[PDB]
């Protein structure tokens, strides 16, 4: 089961994006072997628990999760997306250039810096 809560169903995604109950949402898609998210995955432990009470990530494969295969959905190494307010939002988790995180490079420094700006500018309130 691992640390980093995952998730890979229609059901569990679906309700998971409302059932928020805290702040954002942040969500991968790729491989469970996949380099890029080694990486990332090692940052997660570092910029977890730091503001877990407001954000709520979640792995998912791009094989087990339903998320419309169409027939050829596949076809980039890997990559991050956040969710707020049941919406969907384009939020790196750390771009150090351009381009989302597919090759993954910021470890936990770029990431807290977004991860401040995200979970702090999507909270959406007066606090």
């Given at each position: 089961?691992?640390?980093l809560?995952?998730?890979?169903?229609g059901?569990?995604?679906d309700?998971?994006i409302?059932?928020?109950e805290?702040r954002?949402?942040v969500?991968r898609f790729?491989?469970?072997?996949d380099?890029?998210?080694?990486?990332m995955?090692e940052?997660?432990?570092?910029i977890?628990?730091?503001?877990?009470?407001?954000?709520?990530?979640?792995?998912?494969?791009?094989?087990?999760?339903?998320d419309?295969?169409?027939m050829?959905?596949?076809?980039?190494?890997?990559?991050?997306?956040?969710?707020?307010?049941?919406?969907?939002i384009?939020?790196?988790?750390?771009?150090?250039?351009?381009?989302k995180?597919?090759?993954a490079?910021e470890?936990?420094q770029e990431?807290?810096?977004?991860?401040?700006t995200?979970?702090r500018?999507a909270?959406?309130?007066?606090?």
């Amino acid at each position: 089961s691992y640390m980093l809560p995952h998730l890979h169903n229609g059901w569990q995604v679906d309700q998971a994006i409302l059932s928020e109950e805290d702040r954002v949402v942040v969500i991968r898609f790729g491989h469970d072997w996949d380099p890029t998210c080694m990486k990332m995955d090692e940052v997660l432990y570092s910029i977890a628990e730091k503001v877990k009470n407001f954000a709520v990530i979640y792995l998912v494969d791009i094989t087990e999760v339903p998320d419309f295969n169409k027939m050829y959905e596949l076809y980039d190494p890997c990559t991050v997306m956040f969710f707020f307010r049941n919406k969907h939002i384009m939020i790196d988790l750390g771009t150090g250039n351009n381009n989302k995180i597919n090759w993954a490079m910021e470890d936990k420094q770029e990431m807290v810096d977004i991860i401040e700006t995200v979970y702090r500018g999507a909270r959406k309130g007066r606090g």
